[PDB]
Design a protein around this ligand. Sequence first.
Ligand code: Q82
Lengths: 99, 99
Amino acid sequence: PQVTLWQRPLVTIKIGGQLKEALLDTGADDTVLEEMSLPGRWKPKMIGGIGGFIKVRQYDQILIEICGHKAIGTVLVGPTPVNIIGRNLLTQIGATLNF
Amino acid sequence: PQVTLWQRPLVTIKIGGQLKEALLDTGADDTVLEEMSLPGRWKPKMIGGIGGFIKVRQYDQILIEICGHKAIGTVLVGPTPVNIIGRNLLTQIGATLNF
Ligand SMILES: N#CN=C1N(Cc2ccc(CO)cc2)[C@H](Cc2ccccc2)[C@H](O)[C@@H](O)[C@@H](Cc2ccccc2)N1Cc1ccc(CO)cc1
């Protein structure tokens, strides 16, 4: 799907048996999800934001289905106001920016 | 051009007779630049974020040259660890996300 940017690019994702809506964010290095329940297995970390620093938990090897595609990797889970799919997963989904 | 996402989608921008580098960011509604010498007047504003809040100066009808493309719009100036090109401009240079 070619996604024009007049509207926020939102996609449906499935994680840990749950359905969410997430943002395709080319500016994000990692993926960060709003507080959710996960089986695991997790490490802490604080990240960079605008503005401020947020402590997040690091879950690696998480299966994510994004718009239909299966992808595995590390997702941070923190106090985000929105679900963000950063480059770590975008690359697996074979996503691209065109202009 | 076509950009893959293995690395940060950084582009060269000319703004106010100054050359900078910015991050194409599909997840940013607006464009937010680090602090710089911008002529003209601006209105105060506050953008939301992750674990914080940055008060920025809103400037409008500002000429921005992204890659070779020229665009005019609202640019937010403020304290950001990165220069971000948001959808308000992305839309103007015709960028599409594809996956
Ligand atoms: N804040 C923040 N946080 C943000 N912003 C700014 C941002 C936010 C909002 C606007 C306009 O309202 C403009 C810019 C938006 C996130 C977002 C989007 C909408 C609403 C809330 C949060 C962007 O979509 C998102 O790509 C980045 C932008 C950014 C990148 C690098 C350094 C600093 C910032 N980010 C922090 C971030 C970094 C790293 C990871 C993973 O490694 C996830 C998230």
